Amino acid sequence: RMYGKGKGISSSTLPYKRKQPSWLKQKPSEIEDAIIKLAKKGQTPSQIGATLRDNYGIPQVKSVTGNKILRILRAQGIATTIPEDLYFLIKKAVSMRKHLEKNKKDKDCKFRLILTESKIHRISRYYKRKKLLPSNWKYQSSTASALIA
Amino acid sequence: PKKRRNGGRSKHNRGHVNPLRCSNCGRCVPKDKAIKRFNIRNIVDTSAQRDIKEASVYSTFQLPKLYIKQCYCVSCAIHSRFVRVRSREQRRVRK
């Protein structure tokens, strides 16, 4: 774990079968359109995959079609300018700062906000080392509330 | 050289334990370290029981008990004989 203690090995393990499940006679001719419609209706790719697994019964979009969900979203041009995890971290930091402004006596909240901003800086450094984020992206803490956009 | 494995108290996964006060001397002692004795005693001895039950009414009177629950520091417990010094090998045994 990045901060604190606890190994917490809870996760999801993909099946050995890499290919599309045999019982799925469904055709991949419209699964990408389904995810595109879902993203248009407004869903982050994580919950797009979750909704696809639950309500559509088509696990491992990568197995159904040899291309992964955020990748097809980018290929269609729908993908957001800020990656999902970084945006969620920014939202958490914005909420925490909004709370702290009212309660400056919340030392624990201040500490965890420092931790969250450290994570934000590390992951933004990674994303701008890749070309997934503009080189001038900084995350100043003043206008992050509207930076979600 | 670390007389006891537990350090003389029962603190684990914990930073601080609020202290209580010795019933005998009033010393501050951590709650996990204090020697606790829950005394459920008779209000009187057997002879006084035999006196006041027959001097009482309802013909079935049962005397109430006294629930004390004292706590002592190490020095007071040792002096009042609630705990013994014990031998090194016997020091491990609790019950």
Partner: protein, 76 residues
């Protein structure tokens, strides 16, 4: 002797060959005769195809399903 091990079902996830414990099932409500796909350990609420009814309640585990009906694995 860890190569031909066989009774590792009770072994925790990520055993010698990591395989998920979840699966997919087809559900049929009595008197409704409908076909739909469902995920064990589902996290959302699902509705039937023929007649809109409740099927499973998303909990921390394998859901609760309904009192009756027939649910069968989709494994081949």
């Amino acid at each position: 002797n860890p190569d031909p091990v066989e009774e590792s079902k009770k072994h925790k996830l990520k055993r010698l060959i990591p395989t998920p414990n979840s699966y997919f099932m087809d559900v049929k409500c009595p008197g409704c005769l409908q076909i739909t796909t469902l995920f064990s350990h589902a996290q959302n609420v699902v509705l039937c195809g023929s007649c809109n009814i409740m099927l499973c309640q998303p909990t921390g585990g394998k859901c609760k399903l309904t009192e009756g009906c027939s649910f069968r694995k989709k494994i081949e």
